[PDB]
Amino acid sequence: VTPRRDAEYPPPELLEALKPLHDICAKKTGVTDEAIIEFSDGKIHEDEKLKCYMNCLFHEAKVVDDNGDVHLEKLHDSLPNSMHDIAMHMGKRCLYPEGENLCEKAFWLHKCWKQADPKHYFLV
Ligand SMILES: CCCCCCCCCC[C@H](OC(C)=O)[C@H]1CCCC(=O)O1
Ligand SMILES: [Mg+2]
Ligand SMILES: [Mg+2]
Ligand SMILES: [Mg+2]
């Protein structure tokens, strides 16, 4: 369960692709750096700005359907090949997000993934 953090994982090319999305979403949502890093490397915690940040990243990454809900196939296909099997196992019992709004369902997904596989979960 200890987070995996080394030269290959999270993939540096994915981190570099996420950085401009982070910059957009951090300013739109106001989330704190401490909130992101705790959720990534530490414990699940509940923060409304963080939930909105998670929804915003899915929108900025273009992995949402016409209603703004995550399209898990588009998401899976956007990850590096090195992460295809890790992501599949992390997400196979997280198919159907619950929540009344898009921030809540984004948070639901991130909690579900982090509980399923805390070693490979990360957030930036
Ligand atoms: C049939 C199975 C469908 C699988 C659907 C895709 C699952 C994606 C799993 C979550 C992604 O994490 C990993 C390790 O792939 C996210 C975490 C936010 C940071 C990130 O880059 O990716
Ligand atoms: Mg570049
Ligand atoms: Mg920042
Ligand atoms: Mg800690």
* Binding residue ranges: 22
Structural determination approach? X-ray
Alpha-carbon gap, residue 73 to 85, rounded angstroms: 13
Domains held by the chain: number: 1
Å from CA of 108 to ligand 2 middle: 31
- Check which CATH number belongs to the domain holding 99 and give it: 1.10.238.20
Degrees, nearest 5: CA angle 21-24-26: 100
52 Cβ below 6 A of ligand 1: no
Residue to mutate (ligand 1; options 70, 73, 90, 115; most atoms within 8 A of CB)? 90
Give whole-number Cα distances, 11 to 52, 70, 97, 119, in Å: 24, 21, 26, 14
CB atoms within 10 A of CB 58: 23
CA of 38 to the centre of ligand 2 (A): 27
DSSP 99: -
Cβ(1)–Cβ(83) below 8 Å: no
Whether 2 is covered by a domain: the verdict is: no
- Residue 122 inside a domain? The answer is no
Ligand minimally distant from the alpha carbon of residue 32? 3
Given resolution (angstroms):
1.3
By the 8 A CB rule, do 118 and 110 touch? no
Q: Kindly state whether residue 48 falls inside one of the protein's structural domains.
A: yes
Task: State which residues form the domain around 67.
Answer: 11-117
Structure tokens at 14: 């994915």
Name the DSSP letter for residue 4.
Answer: P
Query: Encoding tokens for residue 119?
Result: 């070693």
CB of 90 within 8 A of CB of 117?
A: yes
93-99: long-range contacts at Cβ-Cβ below 8 A with a sequence spacing of 24 or more? 97/69, 97/70
Q: Residue 123 falls within a domain, yes or no?
A: no
